[PDB]
Amino acid sequence: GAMNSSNYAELFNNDIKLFVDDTNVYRVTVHKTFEGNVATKAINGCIFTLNPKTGHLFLKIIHTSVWAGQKRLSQLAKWKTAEEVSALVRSLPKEEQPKQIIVTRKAMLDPLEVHMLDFPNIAIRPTELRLPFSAAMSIDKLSDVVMKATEPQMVLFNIYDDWLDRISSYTAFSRLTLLLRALKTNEESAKMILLSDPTITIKSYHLWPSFTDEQWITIESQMRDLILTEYGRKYNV
Amino acid sequence: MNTVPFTSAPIEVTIGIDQYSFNVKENQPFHGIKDIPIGHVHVIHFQHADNSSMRYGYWFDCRMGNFYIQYDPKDGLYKMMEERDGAKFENIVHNFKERQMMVSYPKIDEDDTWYNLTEFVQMDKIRKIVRKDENQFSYVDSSMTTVQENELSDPAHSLNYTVINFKSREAIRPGHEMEDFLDKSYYLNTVMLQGIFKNSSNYFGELQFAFLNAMFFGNYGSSLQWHAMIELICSSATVPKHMLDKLDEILYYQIKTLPEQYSDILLNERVWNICLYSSFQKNSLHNTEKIMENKYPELL
Ligand SMILES: CCNC(=O)CN[C@@H](C)c1ccc(F)cc1F
Numbered sequence: 001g002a003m004n005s006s007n008y009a010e011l012f013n014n015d016i017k018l019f020v021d022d023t024n025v026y027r028v029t030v031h032k033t034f035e036g037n038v039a040t041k042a043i044n045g046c047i048f049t050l051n052p053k054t055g056h057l058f059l060k061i062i063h064t065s066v067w068a069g070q071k072r073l074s075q076l077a078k079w080k081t082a083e084e085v086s087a088l089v090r091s092l093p094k095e096e097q098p099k100q101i102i103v104t105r106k107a108m109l110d111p112l113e114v115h116m117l118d119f120p121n122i123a124i125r126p127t128e129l130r131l132p133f134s135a136a137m138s139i140d141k142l143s144d145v146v147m148k149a150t151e152p153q154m155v156l157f158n159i160y161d162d163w164l165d166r167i168s169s170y171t172a173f174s175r176l177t178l179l180l181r182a183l184k185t186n187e188e189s190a191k192m193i194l195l196s197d198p199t200i201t202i203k204s205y206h207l208w209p210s211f212t213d214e215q216w217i218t219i220e221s222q223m224r225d226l227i228l229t230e231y232g233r234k235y236n237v
Numbered sequence: 238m239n240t241v242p243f244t245s246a247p248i249e250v251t252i253g254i255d256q257y258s259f260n261v262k263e264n265q266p267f268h269g270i271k272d273i274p275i276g277h278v279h280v281i282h283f284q285h286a287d288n289s290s291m292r293y294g295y296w297f298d299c300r301m302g303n304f305y306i307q308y309d310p311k312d313g314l315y316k317m318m319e320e321r322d323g324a325k326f327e328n329i330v331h332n333f334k335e336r337q338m339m340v341s342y343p344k345i346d347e348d349d350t351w352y353n354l355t356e357f358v359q360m361d362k363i364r365k366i367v368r369k370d371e372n373q374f375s376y377v378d379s380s381m382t383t384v385q386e387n388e389l390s391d392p393a394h395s396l397n398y399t400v401i402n403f404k405s406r407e408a409i410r411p412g413h414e415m416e417d418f419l420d421k422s423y424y425l426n427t428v429m430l431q432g433i434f435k436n437s438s439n440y441f442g443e444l445q446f447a448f449l450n451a452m453f454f455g456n457y458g459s460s461l462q463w464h465a466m467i468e469l470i471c472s473s474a475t476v477p478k479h480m481l482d483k484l485d486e487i488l489y490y491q492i493k494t495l496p497e498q499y500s501d502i503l504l505n506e507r508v509w510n511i512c513l514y515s516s517f518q519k520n521s522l523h524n525t526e527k528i529m530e531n532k533y534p535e536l537l
Pocket residue numbers: 242243244245305306320325326329
């Protein structure tokens with residue numbers, strides 16, 4: 001059934017699993033028309049499909065042309081997500097296919113189940129965790145590849161950079177979730193924290209800066225402070 | 238007008254015959270039901286006074302044989318049997334009519350309720366859902382499970398309703414996942430009607446039989462089947478207009494006959510609200526929506 005705080009270490013066992021987040025698939029700006037009505041204009045989106053044990057991120061870029069002439073786009077976006085996830089699974093060798101797919105939003109359950117009927121042995125699960133994967137478009141390199149895309153495209157990343165050389169996947173996922181939660185609560189402050197010191201760089205093949213172990217402890221502490229603050233600033237506490 | 242003779246009534250029992258029921262006391266001089274209308278299937282059903290657990294009964298059509306009931310003290314139930322000696326049977330029914338030991342099927346002349354509940358129900362289709370080929374009548378009880386319930390444990394005692402599953406390869410054409418899931422017309426019209434049932438009359442017959450088993454025996458898998466067959470039609474954007482008009486009549490009479498005190502367990506809130514207010518057919522079931530809103534506004 002659902003994945004929650006009780007069964008959290010399951011994410012880091014040796015059964016292949018993927019999280020799927022659809023929150024950035026259908027993205028729009030809302031604007032006024034010459035007549036004073038309101039309209040939307042789509043911008044490119046992405047499906048965020050992540051193996052939490054290895055850090056592998058299958059980032060399927062959703063180009064605005066897929067919405068041309070279609071109705072009920074928010075509903076279609078869920079089915080398009082499920083179609084692309086199913087296509088990804090079918091493209092992987094059998095030994096690389098997931099045994100579980102965890103959707104971050106429960107409205108993805110029926111679309112993914114129907115698209116995966118050919119895979120009765122892959123479990124489709126919801127979660128009770130409020131995971132911050134919507135903030136993936138606050139990662140500069142990810143936002144850049146999405147906004148520049150001129151056609152549908154899949155781009156593969158490791159969202160943990162090289163962290164798994166020095167830390168476990170539990171610790172790496174916890175660091176990722178902290179970073180993304182911070183970027184979601186106050187993107188400007190979060191990004192200042194990450195890029196304040198100019199002597200720490202992001203390698204060309206990485207997404208995050210090359211912090212030493214000690215600097216990561218300091219960074220992580222700064223991000224917790226932010227989340228607690230903003231939580232004060234918000235509820236006035 | 239046909240007759241079902243009872244050898245005797247050795248245990249106190251409530252006997253129902255279609256929508257009617259009468260109370261028989263232990264060893265009361267009870268010898269059957271006469272004046273049963275010809276042309277319809279019928280059900281004769283039983284609830285013992287001492288153990289209201291297990292309602293059970295028999296679907297039959299008196300055109301197919303001469304049937305009687307006799308109490309078996311070993312298996313502890315009233316059993317339907319066929320009498321092959323027409324001479325003996327006609328003689329027995331006569332002697333019993335003379336002594337006024339049989340109750341008369343109490344139908345009001347104006348009343349079309351039983352016809353309206355069984356319009357499409359045929360004994361031959363009942364006998365394919367309830368498989369016991371050596372008898373011309375069919376036993377059903379409260380506890381019998383359906384084939385679909387058994388997939389999720391005695392096959393001989395199962396209700397072989399047609400399996401309906403909205404998240405199945407049968408229901409979903411490869412490449413039409415969203416389309417077929419959100420509009421079930423291909424599963425209704427091509428898979429079920431053209432492929433399995435052959436026509437809408439057979440579909441409606443099974444739907445009507447499922448409802449009646451739910452209502453008379455509290456058979457849970459039959460209630461599930463009834464609602465699934467309703468939901469399949471309501472969730473189809475494309476349904477022949479004659480089928481929608483007939484469904485409205487069918488459901489109207491089912492809702493009219495449903496005991497008020499059983500509506501809480503026999504009606505699924507989700508299905509009815511979806512069907513009457515959200516589905517493609519939300520504006521096609523006028524009679525059913527009107528009786529539901531006036532009789533069971535709470536559920537909605
Ligand atoms: C061989 C023993 N079996 C029978 O006599 C079964 N015959 C039925 C028609 C019957 C018999 C006696 C009754 F009082 C009432 C009946 F309905």
